[PDB]
Amino acid sequence: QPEPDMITIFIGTWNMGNAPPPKKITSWFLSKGQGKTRDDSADYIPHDIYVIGTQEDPLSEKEWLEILKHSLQEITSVTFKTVAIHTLWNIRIVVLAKPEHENRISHICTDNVKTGIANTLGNKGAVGVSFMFNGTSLGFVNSHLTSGSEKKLRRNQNYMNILRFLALGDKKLSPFNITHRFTHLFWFGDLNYRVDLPTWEAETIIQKIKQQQYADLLSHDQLLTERREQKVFLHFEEEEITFAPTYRFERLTRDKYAYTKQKATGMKYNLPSWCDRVLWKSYPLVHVVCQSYGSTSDIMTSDHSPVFATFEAGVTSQFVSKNGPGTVDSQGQIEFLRCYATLKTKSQTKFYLEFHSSCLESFVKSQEGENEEGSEGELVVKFGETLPKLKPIISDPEYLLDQHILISIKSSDSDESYGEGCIALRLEATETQLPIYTPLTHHGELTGHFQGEIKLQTSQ
């Protein structure tokens, strides 16, 4: 039975509005309703992994697992295995997988972050799950961010706190936050970004939604505009939105948006908004294709409609050779030529690099680079031809070209990372000097760039 080189992943996010679900929610898992929907001809074909994020979830873990498993079994006739379930307050993540994947899945981690201080600590934050699927690391974040049209900055702060403090994935990757720990990272939830138009335009917005004319609404979506200004979700992807705003509905119909200020809303307007979102970030040159992104039309217990997104995701096998794992393969080497980091920092310490990769026995520390002044004020750290030769565990090009090198640039004085990035080994050529490039982030904000050349030697 061969190991897969692709899997499909279902991502669901639903703010349940503290109400039990209706008896049938199969449309969610089938990617049926509005937007980019799944072909009818696929309905019996199970996804390999289903990741369900809920917010304002009133159910016990047991109650929700019984509804989810029984839903998937009715669709697929497959009894899914529970990989992980983690709840913070009313924020919940469930990971279900096909039984054939039980012995492909390992290194399961769960964590949560509570966002805010005093007043603002008590119901918002994130849950997450990570695991290995054969040679591929997968991370999943369900966040319920701060509500309110006038709190986009708070939401951006919630995002930074979650990506700094959520403890998922390989703890040996110590310089790296969750935005670098995974081959594929899916971040979804009630992100709570609103359509930023005047309150007096509510009925005009509703009109536009009834005509399925979303362009003038999406141009004011705070998540799209904040992302375009690099304020949040830097280096994440989102599929084009082609479904109506998923909030705020009158319960038990989808015919009415309930936007007017009420005591129950803290006297706040809730203009129709795309609160409920799925974004991802995969390592460079790994296959990931969104095959659905939409909302259900027939699940109306909440003031939110469920959102679905499905993905094809490239996966690799758990590679064994004569040599590695357990030793190096002298027929393999990674060389870095003419490398330099450009940092936005105003500081003057020496810097060194750390190279982290599952293709190495352990991370590699470089010598300190040479600081120069850039023409436009910047710090340029020159490594030249000084970077150490990396000794992969396996030289087979079928393995090595599928790998990635995480780079941290660290202060010699503090050993603190100033920037993290990632280089794909999926090169156009081996035994050939080729340009490489990564942006550098810290706490998920741009801090610089790393560029140079790579020369990859494999056994072929």
Ligand X SMILES: C[C@@H](Oc1ccc(Cl)cc1)C(N)=O
Interface mask toward ligand X for 219-248; x: CB under 6 A: ------------------------------
* Cβ(15)–Cβ(190) below 8 Å: yes
Q: How far is the CB of 104 from ligand X (least distance, A)?
A: 8
Q: How far is the CB of 132 from ligand X (least distance, A)?
A: 9
* Cβ(245)–Cβ(257) below 8 Å: yes
**Segment lying near ligand X (by CB under 6 A), choices 104-112, 212-220, 259-267, 447-455:** 104-112
What are the distances in angstroms from CA 31 to CA 12, 42, 76, 136?
A: 9, 10, 14, 25
Instruction: Note whether 414 binds ligand X by CB under 6 A.
Output: no
What are the distances in angstroms from CA 152 to CA 163, 240, 374, 419, 431?
A: 17, 21, 35, 25, 48
- C-alpha 268: how far from chain center: 30
Q: List the Cα angle 326/329/332 in 5-degree steps.
A: 140
Instruction: Note whether 101 binds ligand X by CB under 6 A.
Output: yes
Considering only 61, 81, 120, 288, the residue that binds ligand X (CB under 6 A) is 81
Q: Which residues pair with 133 in a beta bridge?
A: 105, 136
Instruction: Note whether 68 binds ligand X by CB under 6 A.
Output: no
Instruction: Note whether 108 binds ligand X by CB under 6 A.
Output: yes
When the beta carbons of 72 and 241 are compared against ligand X, the nearer one is: 72
**Segment lying near ligand X (by CB under 6 A), choices 98-106, 117-125, 292-300, 369-377:** 98-106
How many residues sit close enough to ligand X to count as binding (CB under 6 A)?
Answer: 8
When the beta carbons of 94 and 232 are compared against ligand X, the nearer one is: 94
Task: Return the structure tokens found at 246.
Answer: 């998923």
Range list of β-strands (E), 134-178: 136-144
Instruction: Note whether 94 binds ligand X by CB under 6 A.
Output: no
- Per-residue b/e over 4-22, b at no fewer than 16 CB within 10 Å? beebbbbbbbbbbbebebe
| Angstrom distance (rounded) from CA 149 to CA 397 | 51
**Segment lying near ligand X (by CB under 6 A), choices 94-102, 256-264, 273-281, 438-446:** 94-102
Q: How far is the CB of 95 from ligand X (least distance, A)?
A: 8
Residues 129-158 that bind ligand X (CB under 6 A): none
Q: How far is the CB of 134 from ligand X (least distance, A)?
A: 12
DSSP string, 363-416: -EEPPP-EEEE-TTS-EEEEEET-SPPB--S---HHHHTT-EEEEEEEETTT--
When the beta carbons of 315 and 440 are compared against ligand X, the nearer one is: 315
Pairing relation of β-strands 445-457 and 333-343?
antiparallel
Q: How far is the CB of 163 from ligand X (least distance, A)?
A: 25
* Cβ(343)–Cβ(419) below 8 Å: yes
Instruction: Note whether 106 binds ligand X by CB under 6 A.
Output: yes
| Angstrom distance (rounded) from CA 235 to CA 161 | 17
Instruction: Note whether 76 binds ligand X by CB under 6 A.
Output: no
Q: How far is the CB of 428 from ligand X (least distance, A)?
A: 37
- Per-residue b/e over 110-139, b at no fewer than 16 CB within 10 Å? bbbbbbbeeeeeebbbbbbbbbbbbbbbbb
Residues 282-311 that bind ligand X (CB under 6 A): none
Q: How far is the CB of 194 from ligand X (least distance, A)?
A: 37
When the beta carbons of 46 and 448 are compared against ligand X, the nearer one is: 46
Q: How far is the CB of 97 from ligand X (least distance, A)?
A: 4
- Per-residue b/e over 354-368, b at no fewer than 16 CB within 10 Å? bbbbbbbeebbebee
Instruction: Note whether 105 binds ligand X by CB under 6 A.
Output: yes
Task: Return the structure tokens found at 365.
Answer: 């520390």
Considering only 83, 109, 309, 405, the residue that binds ligand X (CB under 6 A) is 83
When the beta carbons of 169 and 448 are compared against ligand X, the nearer one is: 169
**Segment lying near ligand X (by CB under 6 A), choices 10-18, 96-104, 237-245, 348-356:** 96-104
Instruction: Note whether 102 binds ligand X by CB under 6 A.
Output: yes
Considering only 25, 85, 97, 278, the residue that binds ligand X (CB under 6 A) is 97
When the beta carbons of 82 and 230 are compared against ligand X, the nearer one is: 82
Pick from 159, 165, 216: which is nearest to 193 by CA? 159
**Segment lying near ligand X (by CB under 6 A), choices 95-103, 249-257, 369-377, 383-391:** 95-103
Q: Which residues pair with 292 in a beta bridge?
A: 310
When the beta carbons of 101 and 304 are compared against ligand X, the nearer one is: 101
Instruction: Note whether 100 binds ligand X by CB under 6 A.
Output: no
When the beta carbons of 81 and 164 are compared against ligand X, the nearer one is: 81
Q: How far is the CB of 321 from ligand X (least distance, A)?
A: 25
Pick from 136, 139, 87: which is nearest to 114 by CA? 87
Residues 6+ apart with CB under 8 A from 70: none
Instruction: Kindly list the residues in this chain that would bind ligand X in the complex (CB under 6 A).
Output: 81, 83, 97, 101-102, 105-106, 108
